[PDB]
Design an enzyme around this catalytic site. Structure first.
Site, PDB file in Angstrom:
ATOM      1  N   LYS A 172     -10.068  -4.389  -1.279  1.00 25.14           N
ATOM      2  CA  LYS A 172      -9.498  -5.614  -0.253  1.00 25.14           C
ATOM      3  C   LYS A 172     -10.234  -5.300   1.242  1.00 25.14           C
ATOM      4  CE  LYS A 172      -5.230  -7.085  -0.218  1.00 25.14           C
ATOM      5  NZ  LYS A 172      -3.955  -7.678   0.503  1.00 25.14           N
ATOM      6  N   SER A 197       0.771  -1.567   0.082  1.00 22.07           N
ATOM      7  CA  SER A 197       0.155   0.069   0.117  1.00 22.07           C
ATOM      8  C   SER A 197       1.132   1.309   0.048  1.00 22.07           C
ATOM      9  CB  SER A 197      -0.763   0.500   1.269  1.00 22.07           C
ATOM     10  OG  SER A 197      -2.191  -1.014   1.192  1.00 22.07           O
ATOM     11  N   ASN A 213       2.843 -10.041  10.525  1.00 15.67           N
ATOM     12  CA  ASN A 213       3.183  -8.552  10.222  1.00 15.67           C
ATOM     13  C   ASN A 213       2.968  -7.372  10.309  1.00 15.67           C
ATOM     14  OD1 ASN A 213       2.321  -6.795   7.782  1.00 15.67           O
ATOM     15  ND2 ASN A 213       1.687  -8.430   8.070  1.00 15.67           N
ATOM     16  N   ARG A 214       3.316  -6.378  11.228  1.00 13.63           N
ATOM     17  CA  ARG A 214       2.505  -5.189  11.897  1.00 13.63           C
ATOM     18  C   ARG A 214       3.350  -4.067  11.229  1.00 13.63           C
ATOM     19  NH1 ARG A 214       4.131  -7.409  16.724  1.00 13.63           N
ATOM     20  NH2 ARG A 214       6.071  -6.088  17.700  1.00 13.63           N
ATOM     21  N   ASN A 258      -7.717  -0.356  -0.084  1.00 16.59           N
ATOM     22  CA  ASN A 258      -7.038  -1.517   1.619  1.00 16.59           C
ATOM     23  C   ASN A 258      -8.146  -0.594   2.246  1.00 16.59           C
ATOM     24  OD1 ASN A 258      -6.091  -3.086   2.120  1.00 16.59           O
ATOM     25  ND2 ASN A 258      -4.461  -1.904   2.835  1.00 16.59           N
ATOM     26  N   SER A 316      -6.132  -3.543   5.922  1.00 16.36           N
ATOM     27  CA  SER A 316      -5.026  -3.198   7.585  1.00 16.36           C
ATOM     28  C   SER A 316      -5.246  -3.938   8.848  1.00 16.36           C
ATOM     29  CB  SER A 316      -4.090  -2.245   6.633  1.00 16.36           C
ATOM     30  OG  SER A 316      -2.546  -2.217   7.861  1.00 16.36           O
ATOM     31  N   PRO A 317      -4.630  -5.181   9.157  1.00 12.57           N
ATOM     32  CA  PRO A 317      -5.144  -5.386  10.606  1.00 12.57           C
ATOM     33  C   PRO A 317      -4.092  -4.005  11.362  1.00 12.57           C
ATOM     34  CG  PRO A 317      -2.993  -6.616  10.137  1.00 12.57           C
ATOM     35  CD  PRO A 317      -4.186  -5.529   8.718  1.00 12.57           C
ATOM     36  N   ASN A 318      -3.059  -2.991  10.558  1.00 14.90           N
ATOM     37  CA  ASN A 318      -2.168  -1.921  11.691  1.00 14.90           C
ATOM     38  C   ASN A 318      -2.450  -0.769  11.248  1.00 14.90           C
ATOM     39  OD1 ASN A 318      -0.999  -5.076  12.205  1.00 14.90           O
ATOM     40  ND2 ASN A 318      -0.582  -5.356  10.092  1.00 14.90           N
ATOM     41  N   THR A 319      -2.994  -0.314  11.750  1.00 17.85           N
ATOM     42  CA  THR A 319      -4.193   1.103  11.297  1.00 17.85           C
ATOM     43  C   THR A 319      -4.981   1.372  12.633  1.00 17.85           C
ATOM     44  OG1 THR A 319      -2.645   1.611   9.546  1.00 17.85           O
ATOM     45  CG2 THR A 319      -4.206   3.286  10.146  1.00 17.85           C
ATOM     46  N   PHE A 377       2.020   0.376   7.282  1.00 20.23           N
ATOM     47  CA  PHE A 377       1.720   1.361   6.526  1.00 20.23           C
ATOM     48  C   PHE A 377       2.936   2.623   5.797  1.00 20.23           C
ATOM     49  CE2 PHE A 377      -2.802   0.961   5.543  1.00 20.23           C
ATOM     50  CZ  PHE A 377      -3.159  -0.083   4.888  1.00 20.23           C
ATOM     51  N   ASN A 400      -6.713 -10.333   2.746  1.00 21.56           N
ATOM     52  CA  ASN A 400      -6.130  -9.698   3.140  1.00 21.56           C
ATOM     53  C   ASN A 400      -5.262 -10.128   4.656  1.00 21.56           C
ATOM     54  OD1 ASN A 400      -3.669  -7.692   4.768  1.00 21.56           O
ATOM     55  ND2 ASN A 400      -5.286  -6.176   4.230  1.00 21.56           N
ATOM     56  N   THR A 450       3.562 -14.759   0.936  1.00 21.86           N
ATOM     57  CA  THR A 450       4.146 -15.733   1.962  1.00 21.86           C
ATOM     58  C   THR A 450       4.560 -16.648   1.609  1.00 21.86           C
ATOM     59  OG1 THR A 450       3.199 -14.420   3.910  1.00 21.86           O
ATOM     60  CG2 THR A 450       3.981 -16.130   4.378  1.00 21.86           C
TER      61      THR A 450
HETATM   62  C1  LIG Z   1       5.159  -7.929   4.914  1.00 22.33           C
HETATM   63  C2  LIG Z   1       3.232  -7.781   4.826  1.00 22.33           C
HETATM   64  C3  LIG Z   1       3.172  -7.100   4.123  1.00 22.33           C
HETATM   65  C4  LIG Z   1       1.785  -6.141   3.587  1.00 22.33           C
HETATM   66  N1  LIG Z   1       1.454  -5.379   3.126  1.00 22.33           N
HETATM   67  C5  LIG Z   1       0.406  -5.172   2.226  1.00 22.33           C
HETATM   68  C6  LIG Z   1       0.068  -4.122   2.041  1.00 22.33           C
HETATM   69  O1  LIG Z   1       0.921  -3.103   2.062  1.00 22.33           O
HETATM   70  N2  LIG Z   1      -1.395  -3.626   1.815  1.00 22.33           N
HETATM   71  C7  LIG Z   1      -1.805  -5.080   1.309  1.00 22.33           C
HETATM   72  O2  LIG Z   1      -3.006  -4.901   0.972  1.00 22.33           O
HETATM   73  N3  LIG Z   1      -1.881  -5.575   1.684  1.00 22.33           N
HETATM   74  C8  LIG Z   1       0.115  -6.244   2.157  1.00 22.33           C
HETATM   75  N4  LIG Z   1      -0.134  -8.025   2.892  1.00 22.33           N
HETATM   76  C9  LIG Z   1      -1.378  -8.528   2.611  1.00 22.33           C
HETATM   77  C10 LIG Z   1      -0.863  -9.210   1.430  1.00 22.33           C
HETATM   78  O3  LIG Z   1      -1.467  -8.365   0.442  1.00 22.33           O
HETATM   79  C11 LIG Z   1      -1.980 -10.178   1.539  1.00 22.33           C
HETATM   80  O4  LIG Z   1      -4.018 -10.679   1.552  1.00 22.33           O
HETATM   81  C12 LIG Z   1      -1.737 -11.954   2.369  1.00 22.33           C
HETATM   82  O5  LIG Z   1      -0.150 -11.676   3.087  1.00 22.33           O
HETATM   83  C13 LIG Z   1      -2.175 -12.590   2.145  1.00 22.33           C
HETATM   84  O6  LIG Z   1      -1.790 -13.814   1.535  1.00 22.33           O
HETATM   85  P1  LIG Z   1       0.278 -14.758   1.672  1.00 22.33           P
HETATM   86  O7  LIG Z   1      -0.694 -15.429   2.859  1.00 22.33           O
HETATM   87  O8  LIG Z   1      -0.383 -15.088   0.392  1.00 22.33           O
HETATM   88  O9  LIG Z   1       1.400 -13.691   1.624  1.00 22.33           O
HETATM   89  C14 LIG Z   1       0.902  -8.227   3.352  1.00 22.33           C
HETATM   90  C15 LIG Z   1       1.283  -8.956   3.855  1.00 22.33           C
HETATM   91  C16 LIG Z   1       2.749  -9.178   4.465  1.00 22.33           C
HETATM   92  C17 LIG Z   1       2.859 -11.028   4.511  1.00 22.33           C
HETATM   93  O1  LIG Z   2       1.761  -2.214   6.557  1.00 23.12           O
HETATM   94  C1  LIG Z   2       0.725  -3.322   6.603  1.00 23.12           C
HETATM   95  O2  LIG Z   2       1.426  -2.997   8.363  1.00 23.12           O
HETATM   96  C2  LIG Z   2      -0.170  -4.510   6.461  1.00 23.12           C
HETATM   97  C3  LIG Z   2      -0.833  -4.237   5.278  1.00 23.12           C
HETATM   98  C4  LIG Z   2      -2.136  -4.520   5.151  1.00 23.12           C
HETATM   99  O3  LIG Z   2      -2.700  -3.997   4.773  1.00 23.12           O
HETATM  100  N1  LIG Z   2      -1.752  -5.677   5.748  1.00 23.12           N
HETATM  101  C5  LIG Z   2      -1.198  -6.696   6.389  1.00 23.12           C
HETATM  102  O4  LIG Z   2      -1.000  -7.462   6.617  1.00 23.12           O
HETATM  103  N2  LIG Z   2      -0.166  -5.386   6.785  1.00 23.12           N
END
Ligand SMILES: Cc1cc2nc3c(=O)[nH]c(=O)nc-3n(C[C@H](O)[C@H](O)[C@H](O)COP(=O)(O)O)c2cc1C
Ligand SMILES: O=C(O)c1cc(=O)[nH]c(=O)[nH]1
Ligand SMILES: CCn1c(CO)nn(-c2cc3c(C(C)C)cn(-c4ccccc4C)c(=O)c3cc2F)c1=O
Ligand SMILES: [Cl-]
EC number: 1.3.5.2
Length: 366
Positions: free
Chosen positions: A225, A90, A115-116, A182, A185-188, A119, A254, A327
């Protein structure tokens, strides 16, 4: 192909991950990818893997999920890895640092990450100029079936969430094939409450008005999303709003703020979003529900715990037109992309599907 897959999964990746902190590993990966320092993507995309959705051809249905390339630094290298589409972000309007380190945690026993990041973003201006440097290169990639998505976030300190998303539409919309709002996010703090009904409708109306105001060749699709942690009421409400407003698609899902029973990693109780294998079936079932609630009329990008062709096909049959992963790349490395594609093609043939398109939503027709 299988030589590299085995070496990466059994030896190289676990060795590199044992030497590096998780965020250092992420940063190095982005650098390596941006330099094209990658194993051969030996897999030749077949016609069976092509999907037409969101106003575009996708050469294959396997994309890189948001979060890997937050700042649009590695787009061309990600296509080199064999992804059919790339999503960056994002991206937030203003630059921001995100949360203090450490903010990424490996759960290797679970094939998971928490992750946390919060953004962390270079901000819209920096990303805009990065994308502009390669804008015509991207136009050719898109025409050749390799589209680009841009995922939009909000700043931590913003007092008007909809305005942050509107700014993103105006600045990055003209550089994107699709945009992602988006709201999961769990982190905002407060972000996921933007998934609720009257406010969601007001937010999305504003985003769509901004999108519609872009010139035609610069006018992206808009996707929402969503989280895997929604109530039934929330899912019903989102479906209703998406159909009412004509949102172009959904990205499902997410990361989860739940902690499924059975996680073994020592770091399971860290705050943040959980990704990888423990999320997989929660994400598939969310796809399944959203596909049903939208009558199969709203394209879904399925994401969460995809690491095999079986995983991809389960999401496609549940209703996804395209899938993403992140992942699994942390455990398997770049060869995972070709692995998933090869396995998916084989399974489509084994199950009597002419191509990916024929499998989309197939479980709902049983
Ligand atoms: C390190 C990390 C950072 C992420 N940051 C974002 C983000 O900035 N925006 C977002 O929409 N999803 C973010 N995600 C979520 C991924 O896009 C995805 O929705 C989620 O990890 C599930 O897919 P996976 O199990 O293949 O990783 C992040 C995931 C990880 C692991
Ligand atoms: O920047 C992040 O912490 C982040 C954003 C997001 O949408 N999903 C996520 O798992 N982490
Ligand atoms: C969730 C944060 N996170 C973590 C920690 O949880 N790891 N990780 C990744 C690391 C790597 C690494 C590191 C180990 C050097 C190399 N390579 C690679 C190997 C050989 C050649 C070319 C590359 C890019 C990858 O593909 C890769 C991918 C990743 F997602 C990542 O984004
Ligand atoms: Cl860790």
């Amino acid at each position: 192909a299988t030589g590299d897959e085995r070496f990466y999964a059994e030896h190289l990746m676990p060795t590199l991950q044992g030497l590096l902190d998780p965020e250092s590993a992420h940063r190095l990966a982005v650098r390596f990818t941006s330099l094209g320092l990658l194993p051969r993507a030996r897999f030749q995309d077949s016609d069976m893997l092509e999907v037409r959705v969101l106003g575009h051809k996708f050469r294959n249905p396997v994309g890189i999920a948001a979060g890997f390339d937050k700042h649009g630094e590695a787009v061309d290298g990600l296509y080199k890895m064999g992804f059919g589409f790339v999503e960056i972000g994002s991206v937030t309007p203003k630059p921001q640092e995100g949360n203090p380190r450490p903010r990424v945690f490996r759960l290797p026993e679970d094939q998971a990450v928490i992750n946390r990041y919060g953004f962390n973003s270079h901000g819209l201006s920096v990303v805009e100029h990065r994308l502009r440097a390669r804008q015509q290169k991207q136009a050719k990639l898109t025409e050749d079936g390799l589209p680009l998505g841009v995922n939009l976030g909000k700043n931590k300190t913003s007092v008007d969430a909809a305005e942050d998303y509107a700014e993103g539409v105006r600045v990055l919309g003209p550089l994107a094939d699709y945009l992602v709002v988006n709201v999961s996010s769990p982190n905002t703090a407060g972000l996921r409450s933007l998934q609720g009904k009257a406010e969601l409708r007001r937010l999305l109306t504003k985003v769509l008005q901004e999108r519609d105001g872009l010139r035609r060749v610069h006018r992206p699709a808009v996707l929402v999303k969503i989280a895997p942690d929604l109530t039934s009421q929330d899912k019903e409400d989102i479906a209703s709003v998406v159909k009412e407003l004509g949102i172009d698609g959904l990205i499902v899902t997410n990361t989860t703020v739940s902690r499924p029973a059975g996680l073994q990693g020592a770091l399971r109780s860290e705050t943040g979003g959980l990704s990888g294998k423990p999320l997989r079936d929660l994400s598939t079932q969310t796809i399944r529900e959203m596909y049903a609630l939208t009558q199969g009329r709203v394209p879904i990008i399925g994401v969460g715990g995809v690491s095999s062709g079986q995983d991809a096909l389960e999401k496609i049959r549940a209703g996804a037109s395209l899938v993403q992963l992140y992942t699994a790349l942390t455990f398997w490395g770049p060869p995972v992309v070709g692995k998933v594609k090869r396995e998916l093609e084989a399974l489509l043939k084994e199950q009597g599907f002419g191509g990916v398109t024929d499998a989309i939503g197939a479980d709902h027709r049983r």
